[PDB]
Amino acid sequence: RCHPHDLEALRDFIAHLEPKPDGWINSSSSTDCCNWTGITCNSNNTGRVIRLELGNKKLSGKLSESLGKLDEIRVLNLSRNFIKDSIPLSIFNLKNLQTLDLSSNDLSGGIPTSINLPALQSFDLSSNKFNGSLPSHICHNSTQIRVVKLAVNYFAGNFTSGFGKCVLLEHLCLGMNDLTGNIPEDLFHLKRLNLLGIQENRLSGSLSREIRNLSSLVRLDVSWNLFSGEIPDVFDELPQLKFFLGQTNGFIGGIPKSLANSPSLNLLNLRNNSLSGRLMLNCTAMIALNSLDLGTNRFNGRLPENLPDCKRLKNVNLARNTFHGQVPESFKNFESLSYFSLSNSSLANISSALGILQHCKNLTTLVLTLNFHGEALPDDSSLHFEKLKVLVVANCRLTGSMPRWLSSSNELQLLDLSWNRLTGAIPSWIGDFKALFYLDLSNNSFTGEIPKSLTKLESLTSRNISVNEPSPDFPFFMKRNESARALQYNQIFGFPPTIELGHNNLSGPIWEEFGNLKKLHVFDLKWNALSGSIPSSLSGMTSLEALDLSNNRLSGSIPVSLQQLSFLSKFSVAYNNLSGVIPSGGQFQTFPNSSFESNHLCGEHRFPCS
């Protein structure tokens, strides 16, 4: 038997919410509230209600005003439900409420102009429908507040002054709203703040030098705003800074000396800014740096020779910059290097690059695309990359043959050599990589037949090959042609298992044994010299989604068995020698005429047509 006041308040609360939780089915009868689901009391369990924690209960409805009658409640947690409409005023007057988590519901409207919650520690409204002015006036009566989480709301208007009066504020999360203007100078009074997310708003102006006043910062997320100007060179004042996220802004200048000297930074992401000049870090000074993303900037000059002196730097993305010259010779010592993305950086001497980089024994994923333009792909067979998983060197217009030194990387998972000038036959050892699920050799000069060993590729047949996906900190992008919008893959295993051989000079038949690859999603043979019959055994490729045979010289008929490919949504035989009926119904009726054009193929009952 509990207090009549709590009993009442709790009965009204649940009157507005469905479903009734497990222990609340007795609610209108039962007098023992403290043993209801998600309720806690003082004394032992036997006093006033101090905690109402109903998070992730699938609760649907509105909040009762009589929630404000629980005088002793220190913790109110309704997060991860379907609760909607307004927050009752009476909730903002609870004298004992330490912890308020309303995050992730459908709540809307606005916060009252007058709030008195003297005991409040953490305040979490994130992931809701709240708009309007930021409730910075909460600082007046909650002098103890540690945590304000407002992220993922509709707050627009100025980033409003007044948070600086929450003197003990530690976490402040404003991310993913519509805020405009610069950071109120008010904010720079919070000397105990260790987390500032402002990311994904419309904020702009320079990032003030007054930021040196927030000396407790650990994580600074400024990403995805309109900031510009130089990054202020204050970072010796922020000795605890571990994560700095500035990506997708208008920052200019280089990396400030103080940031380039910070011993505490784990992670620096400045990608997609307006940054420029020589790239200078003092790697003797940055002993915590494990991850560096400078992509889509204008850094120029040579690649900094001292980079391997960051003994912890695992992840490096320098892509889409203005460098020139070769990979420094010191990169032989980059012992920590795992993921190295150099795409589109104007690098020279792929020969030196590969001969140096083979000495980095932790290298797993390497992206060299759009460098070394017109160079000759090194065939030199002392090259050995032992732990290599992902190798992308594409659209470099490279010359030579398929390099056999590659055959010794047994871990290899994804290989993209496409859009080069490579020539000669595709060698048998390409079928020997057991972990390879993706290979793009397309748009080269390759000749000869298709090696039969592609039919016994292990990751494309059985399910008994199992390996760990590489985990670089950057996404990968995929372009079909020069004017196509790109596709994004955050993880390597997001790529469909793929054999892409199109636009080469390959000849001979399509092996019946391709019916062995049960796990292949994409088979692209288009724009080759291939001939013979389309094998009926292809109906055995059970995971097949896209089959492109177009622009070859293939003869005979489309085998009916192909209609047993359950997942095939994308098919073309156009520009071949084929004849007869296109198989009716099922899967093939969904393909457009263009899939069969420039053949002698006709729809059923239409033969001959032309």
Partner: peptide, 5 residues
């Protein structure tokens, strides 16, 4: 072709 940025 695959690229990175």
């Amino acid at each position: 072709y695959i690229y990175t940025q």
